[PDB]
Task: inverse folding
């Protein structure tokens, strides 16, 4: 039923209100997701002027319900199962040798649109560090998001490490701790351990005057295999 909502192309909107070391900002985003292909296309604009942090640091914050779950893993898709009422997604993002983001978001349908509404608080950043000093390259690596069930909270937890390329050729680690909990009362799928394999590409809109980021993402779940017998049946 939740999965039925994602069989075609679904329009997406994003809102973020942020405050990093006392620098307040807002972002809005729009695009679409095609969970059949695990495909996301999104464009974000800073509505308050110039973004006070590098665009790449906000990628993970700005809809894992669009993941492509292979047929044999459909019982492990918590994200879709919580729709349309949606889920709360909370994170701590710890930049190594630098500050932290603290995020809370609601992801849910508003009409036929999947909407991600976020607040972000940032603290303990170095004015001359990679983040406030804007020393990140405008690009993105590929990462695995490791998911485990959190039966107590009737949801999931995830942990992963984002690697941000720094202009001098080093890498800035951003350790991600994540939890998701359904908004609704209905039953949801509590998964076995697995991961989302994620590729992201950042670009610019040549016609866009605002501070902005264009994102193209492909997300496919993995880490759970067919049984041996299923492999023989598939082969035949």
Result:
């Amino acid at each position: 039923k939740g999965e039925e909502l994602f069989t075609g192309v679904v329009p997406i909107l994003v809102x973020l209100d942020g405050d990093v070391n006392g620098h307040k900002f807002s972002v809005s985003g729009e695009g679409e997701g095609d969970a059949t292909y695990g495909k996301l296309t999104l464009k974000f604009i800073c509505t308050t002027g110039k973004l006070p942090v590098p665009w790449p640091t906000l990628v993970t914050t700005f809809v894992q319900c669009f993941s492509r779950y292979p047929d044999h893993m459909k019982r492990h898709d918590f994200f879709k199962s919580a729709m349309p009422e949606g889920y709360v997604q909370e994170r701590t993002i710890s930049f190594k040798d630098d500050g932290n983001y603290k995020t809370r978001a609601e992801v849910k349908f508003e009409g036929d649109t999947l909407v991600n509404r976020i607040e972000l608080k940032g603290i303990d950043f170095k004015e001359d560090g990679n983040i406030l000093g804007h020393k990140l390259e405008y690009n993105y690596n590929s990462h695995n998001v490791y998911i485990t069930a959190d039966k107590q909270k009737n949801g999931i937890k995830a942990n992963f490490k984002i690697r941000h390329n720094v202009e001098d050729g080093s890498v800035q680690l951003a350790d991600h701790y994540q939890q998701n909990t359904p908004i609704g009362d209905g039953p949801v799928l509590l998964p076995d351990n697995h991961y989302l394999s994620t590729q992201s590409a950042l670009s610019k809109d040549p016609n866009e005057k605002r501070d902005h980021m264009v994102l193209l993402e492909f997300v496919t779940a993995a880490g759970i295999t067919h049984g041996m017998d299923e492999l023989y049946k598939l082969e035949h």
Notes: The two ends are 31 Å apart (CA to CA).
